[PDB]
Design a protein around this nucleic acid. Sequence first.
RNA 1: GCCGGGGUGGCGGAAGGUAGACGCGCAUGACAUCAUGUGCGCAAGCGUGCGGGUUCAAGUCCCGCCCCCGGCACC
Length: 876
Amino acid sequence: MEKYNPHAIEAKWQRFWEEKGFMKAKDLPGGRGKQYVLVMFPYPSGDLHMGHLKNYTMGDVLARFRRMQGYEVLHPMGWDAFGLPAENAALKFGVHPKDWTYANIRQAKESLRLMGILYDWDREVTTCEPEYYRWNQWIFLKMWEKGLAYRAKGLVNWCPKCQTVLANEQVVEGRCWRHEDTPVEKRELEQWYLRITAYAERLLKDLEGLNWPEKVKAMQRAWIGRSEGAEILFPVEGKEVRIPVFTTRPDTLFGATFLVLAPEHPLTLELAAPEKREEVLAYVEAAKRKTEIERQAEGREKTGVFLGAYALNPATGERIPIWTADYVLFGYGTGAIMAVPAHDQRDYEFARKFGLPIKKVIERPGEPLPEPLERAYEEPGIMVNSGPFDGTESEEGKRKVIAWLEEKGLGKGRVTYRLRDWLISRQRYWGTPIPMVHCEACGVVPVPEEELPVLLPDLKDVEDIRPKGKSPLEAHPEFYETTCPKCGGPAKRDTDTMDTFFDSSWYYLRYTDPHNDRLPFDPEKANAWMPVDQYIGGVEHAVLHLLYSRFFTKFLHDLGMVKVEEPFQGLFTQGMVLAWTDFGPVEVEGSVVRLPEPTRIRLEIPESALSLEDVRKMGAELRPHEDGTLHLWKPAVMSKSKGNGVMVGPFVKEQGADIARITILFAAPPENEMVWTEEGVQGAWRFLNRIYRRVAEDREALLETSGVFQAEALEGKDRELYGKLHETLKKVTEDLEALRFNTAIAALMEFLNALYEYRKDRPVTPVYRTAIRYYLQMLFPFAPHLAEELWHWFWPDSLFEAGWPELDEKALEKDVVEVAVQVNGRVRGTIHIPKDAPLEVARAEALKVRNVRAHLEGKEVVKEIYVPGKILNLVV
RNA sequence: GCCGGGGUGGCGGAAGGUAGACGCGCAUGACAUCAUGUGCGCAAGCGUGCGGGUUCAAGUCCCGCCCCCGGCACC
Ligand SMILES: CC(C)C[C@H](N)C(=O)O
Ligand SMILES: [Hg+2]
Ligand SMILES: [Zn+2]
Ligand SMILES: [Zn+2]
């Protein structure tokens, strides 16, 4: 008997699936239904390795299942060549981006293919191309003319590693997104934004119906950040200006004893009294320079200045000082607060600190507040010390006092959003050139549609396009030295670019019609596939791409080009692939693991000594090693950086794809994190041969056998198996639909076992062949190649055409169950009787069990409880 | 602190009514591989975060805490 040879089959069939273009995406889905399966596309920057390959595989299993079910299936792939991710890397290995990007691609495709992944490569999309980014601009313009693209001054964030700015959603922990070490500083810059706050309520209210993981939803609810409230207006002393302040407790207005403008408020220095102007000017250059790391290092300690102005209280109608504490933020609300310190601890502690008087206005129910009050009273109650309101309920207070202002024109009700507009000007060569020129007569004038695309200049000095501080395009005037399209005057093109996240906010829509040279896509095409039914990807994009994209799909829908409104109907988040990683040498002594200082640094503890048990409980082993010493290993995250990634290309050659796939599929649930391992890769190697051999041992014994038989005339063991099969199908099929591929497969192996146990007493019968025909189609999604090899030993056509095996519900009907006997809960033993076999029978068959355990303690009995399914309990 | 999601064999995990499917590791029997056994306890008996409890039957239901992971935390 021959053996399973990956290298014999796996690459042969690949060549075939492409030639016979199965996953060729249809243009305009007709009858049988549609399914759009999508893996988030890769920034090309590194060679791929299992760690990456998890997600891509998912989508592919999924996609063969749909296509096996006869759905019309779009499973596309492309790249994310533009913006920081690539360039960053290119530069880090001094390579010109085009050469690097069109190279990292080639390698990527070759991995994906190797594994057995299939796409419709006639839809490939290289964002960095002009072919594409032309539209990224087309969008920008359509966005400008609808008021939603603009420039504006303000505090941008600065990444010195990247030598550019980033949007707020790229500042995680308080640090650059792709550099989880380099903190970001603030800088004053007129820059381009996209007005995303014009969609805040929609972005929030449309989440409700969206079937996403509660975790991405929950993050997007809080980040967008609704707050109902009211904009009150404080006149400044004598000055014709007035000061707006967001409050969620306008029922305190009388308790206002001062105001606090956020450090970089225009009105901070503009009102600064010329005595205190010196101290106030120092506190800004202090604030600005201090970063989001150090703000939390300081702790929640209050710190400020008195400006030397005043402000009238709308309500009481008297003066009060105005301060500039940094505990009010400027990128939210007004950048200014009415500060009641008697009902809000933050302000209390500012009042408790800088002697700023503290006024009570909301007296507590039954038991009253003390005087002096020694902390805040944030909970609500009855209004006091507030003139005509004296007696009112704090809850009703809000809407009344709001209403009271709405008359006198002193204020209004409003709903600010935490969402801050999406900055996209990047000071980098690599990235879409913003399609706007700067005029001298006519302001800042757009570019005509038909003039597009605004191509990047070509720049072949690698050590030129390195980003120095200002835009790398500035150094090249010829680019910007152009005319206007409004009159014809002197004209500097904008030297800035679009962030990579831009292109990654509709690529899903581009895939539907990826050669259209007139639009970003013919809508008839978009609507024919969208929404995406399955977006297979990860949490790290919860408030970035998965926010940006939607706003884009909304605004594209608000030009009426896409009918839907949420682009992904089905987000499925996935787990990181972990590997066992060598951490370094260790000095063992009896039962005391001493840690040298590079191996402790790498572990990230402070300790040097450890018990062997201390190693265990942090989930690590100590192994031998090449160098002679003992070495400590612990699962760590599979990255290039960690130097622990299982490489796809090499790995395929010295093992296989299907084994790759079974390994990354059958370990953990998909949404869990998993650990790729020798122990598991072998598991695969076993499971895949028990498939092979069992169909090899029966190759002759099948050919001369027909897979036709009268369903209800199978008796005995042919009757059992056929049941088990169909029970199995139901589980393989229900667990494909759920995306539960771990257990899905387990359930496939269980039958294989049972198929070995079938053949032990029972030769190749029709049932068994049909048991195989089925098994192999049930295998095609995961182990497609070994699944195709065995099929074609018998059948003339591909598994893709074979159709998803149809379920026979009446095989699931259980007859002669195994039913557990218990007496007072303790499961004494099990008996075998038909489902409906009534109470009177079970009694009989129990009374004389394996160890007559039912009698052992059943010498009384009072009530008795049968239940047809699987239980019979005797009481006492 | 708030939100989000988890505490079940030696491991990843499976699931009101036989807890521990399937695999890994371990252990013996075959000519690495297949077969066979494997919650724990020598046993009495015990076991799904910890305590009560409701139920003939609780991983599953109720009341009261605990703890780990992820994110947001002067908004
Ligand atoms: C969907 C995309 C924003 C994904 C991104 N290109 C990445 O590689 O993570
Ligand atoms: Hg390109
Ligand atoms: Zn950076
Ligand atoms: Zn002009």
